[PDB]
């Protein structure tokens, strides 16, 4: 076998994408039941973007100012409201393709699939992790805004993200499906910045455990370490320091495999300090930090 | 600036996946019109897999030994035949979700999306390239044979691959949709080793061109090279030799950027010899070799 990073099948989400247009702006929307969710900035221009009063802009519009196209077929908007940074459009027809779904808020380090869209049309899917600074590095070839992140739990779709903008650093920021941003970011074209781009230490560890599980074990060692010393080294290399909850989360993977979390931490410490000297783990020539402890526990071994 | 390897949305291919079971073995099948395609070793006990007599296991099978399930529906098989390493099962129902499609044979270096399954159940999707040794680095679960590889050209699905085997090295081998293997492999348990892995120089060059298109071009050196000398450096670093055929394929990107193919070859040559030295390229600290010249063109005529 071996290891490949995978996104969840996008079919159930593809049937919920639509196009939303206001004036000259066209972007992607999420049609569930009789509602279409999209970033509220679709009602802006670029002039407005500089310091917008959304309550003011919103009231200047009717149901008719909104054009939502599900393919080459038009949907009629019969109402609207704003819920934090999303526009919540009521339409005259419930989406026959609505999957069983939930709205969940995720946290940094957690993973999900993203169906990148194109002014209403799905064109690609990828798997990513919300970075420690609450951003997403899915560097969209910068085409269409308002794409969606999700997970699939059995037959149920968990939507957790909706794309909103590009930060002046080239990385992305967005919202949960309640319209609340991830990160200390806002709905405006004021230059603001993401925190330090760091590596998700917890995911790299999960990944090293997966390497052990699939027989890769050359980086291991006889040393152990303390959480503090491990953390001191971690930070020097731009890795997130590991909190006590994070090591609990690795218990299950520690119990199976029989390698104690601090033992694995000692293995990582040595990789950081000595590089990999041209060498691979589960294939990559670099450490992977977009597979969670649960992802490894899913795919490899119940 | 940015990147993300994306796979095609998987919806049209999810609508064609079914589970095929023959005795103890269950594996995925591809349902187009009234035929279900699947690996022929589904008739083989885990026992015969050492060196199977396919013609005989087939003779000894009736339509009724075959259980084909599409969701909660059993499709009755009313005919069965073999075509190379694939089984072709005629079923009672023609697939209503059959997409416009074509069967094509791809060559080493080319990319495609993979819908990874487990008993007619699509569980993951990824983007990969056929490696120069005709293999694929797939992350595989168990029960995924009959996972299919494909490309989407407009509304047309081009099926190019179906999984069959796991090799020694842990890498994968499969066939085209007429059942002929990619590479010098067969559907039997034997030593059979693939050739040395190696990097796809053509895709790396195509990736450098896309880096340049998105404003990341610090790696360019105004100091040129001969094809001949570029290839000798490429072989030192385990990169495939660039043939005149490949130089031609880079033509459209060359014309679009104003960067002669040999100048891009000299930039690569310098990156192999000197390293990146901390710096980034499209956000990666490592060169990407699973993005083709065509994928650059399609993901820049967006």
């Amino acid at each position: 076998s071996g290891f490949r990073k995978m996104a969840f099948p996008s079919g159930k989400v593809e049937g919920c994408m639509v196009q939303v247009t206001c004036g000259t702006t066209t972007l992607n929307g999420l049609w569930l039941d009789d509602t279409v969710y999209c970033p509220r900035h679709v009602i802006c221009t670029a002039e407005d973007m500089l310091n917008p009063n959304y309550e003011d802009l919103l009231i200047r519009k009717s149901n008719h100012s909104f054009l939502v196209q599900a393919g080459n077929v038009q949907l009629r908007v019969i109402g609207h409201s704003m819920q934090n940074c999303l526009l919540r459009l009521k339409v005259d027809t419930s989406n026959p393709k609505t999957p069983k779904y939930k709205f969940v808020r995720i946290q940094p380090g957690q993973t999900f699939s993203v169906l990148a869209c194109y002014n209403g049309s799905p064109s690609g899917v990828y798997q990513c992790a919300m970075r420690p600074n609450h951003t997403i590095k899915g560097s969209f070839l910068n085409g269409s805004c308002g794409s969606v992140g999700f997970n699939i739990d059995y037959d149920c779709v968990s939507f957790c993200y909706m794309h909103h903008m590009e930060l002046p650093t080239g990385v992305h920021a967005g919202t949960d499906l309640e319209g609340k941003f991830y990160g200390p970011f806002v709905d405006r074209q004021t230059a603001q910045a993401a925190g330090t781009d760091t590596t998700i230490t917890l995911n790299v560890l999960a990944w090293l455990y997966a390497a052990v599980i699939n027989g890769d074990r050359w980086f291991l060692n006889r040393f152990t370490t303390t959480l503090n010393d491990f953390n001191l080294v971690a930070m020097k290399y731009n890795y997130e320091p590991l909190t006590q909850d994070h090591v609990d989360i690795l218990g299950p993977l520690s119990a199976q495999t029989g390698i104690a979390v601090l033992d694995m931490c000692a293995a990582l410490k040595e990789l950081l300090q000595n590089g990999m000297n041209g060498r691979t783990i589960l294939g990559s020539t670099i450490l992977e930090d977009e597979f969670t402890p649960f992802d490894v526990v899913r795919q490899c071994s119940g």
Side-chain angles (χ1 to χ4, degrees), chain A residues 6 14 31 38 60 67 69 80-81 101 106 112 137 147 157 176 193 215 224 234 252 257 293 301:
Chain A
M6 304 199 304
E14 283 163 64
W31 182 29
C38 75
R60 312 191 159 181
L67 162 79
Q69 321 193 52
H80 66 284
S81 46
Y101 73 103
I106 53 164
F112 59 96
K137 282 180 172 318
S147 299
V157 172
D176 53 32
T224 175
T257 89
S301 11

Side-chain angles (χ1 to χ4, degrees), chain A residues 137-290:
Chain A
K137 282 180 172 318
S139 221
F140 279 2
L141 303 171
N142 306 306
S144 199
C145 186
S147 299
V148 317
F150 63 94
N151 271 296
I152 291 168
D153 314 296
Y154 311 131
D155 56 331
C156 179
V157 172
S158 282
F159 294 99
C160 65
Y161 177 86
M162 183 174 275
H163 177 78
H164 288 266
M165 59 216 348
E166 166 183 24
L167 265 325
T169 87
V171 308
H172 311 87
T175 269
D176 53 32
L177 275 292
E178 214 122 281
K180 311 172 175 116
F181 267 87
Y182 282 109
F185 306 115
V186 301
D187 244 342
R188 328 171 120 172
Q189 274 301 320
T190 58
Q192 55 197 129
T196 308
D197 187 14
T198 59
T199 297
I200 315 251
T201 304
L202 169 67
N203 281 352
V204 175
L205 291 172
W207 192 71
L208 288 187
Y209 273 106
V212 163
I213 299 163
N214 316 338
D216 246 327
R217 70 206 323 300
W218 74 255
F219 49 89
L220 292 183
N221 69 26
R222 64 174 187 95
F223 299 152
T224 175
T225 188
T226 60
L227 188 55
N228 288 350
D229 179 59
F230 167 70
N231 277 343
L232 147 70
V233 171
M235 270 165 330
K236 170 168 192 181
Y237 287 88
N238 243 245
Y239 268 63
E240 272 313 294
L242 211 62
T243 64
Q244 171 55 58
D245 45 329
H246 299 350
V247 358
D248 293 324
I249 292 162
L250 284 157
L253 273 154
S254 211
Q256 200 207 326
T257 89
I259 301 164
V261 177
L262 296 172
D263 198 17
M264 190 62 82
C265 287
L268 215 206
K269 165 190 302 178
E270 186 171 88
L271 294 171
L272 292 187
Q273 300 182 312
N274 238 267
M276 279 170 77
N277 299 306
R279 219 143 164 223
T280 65
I281 303 176
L282 248 27
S284 292
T285 47
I286 54 289
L287 286 5
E288 173 49 44
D289 82 347
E290 292 197 320

Side-chain angles (χ1 to χ4, degrees), chain A residues 46-66:
Chain A
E47 168 167 75
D48 291 294
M49 265 333 255
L50 320 187
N51 177 20
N53 188 303
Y54 289 95
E55 322 267 324
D56 196 68
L57 297 171
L58 195 41
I59 204 73
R60 312 191 159 181
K61 288 164 80 75
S62 59
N63 297 333
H64 347 154
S65 21
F66 291 103

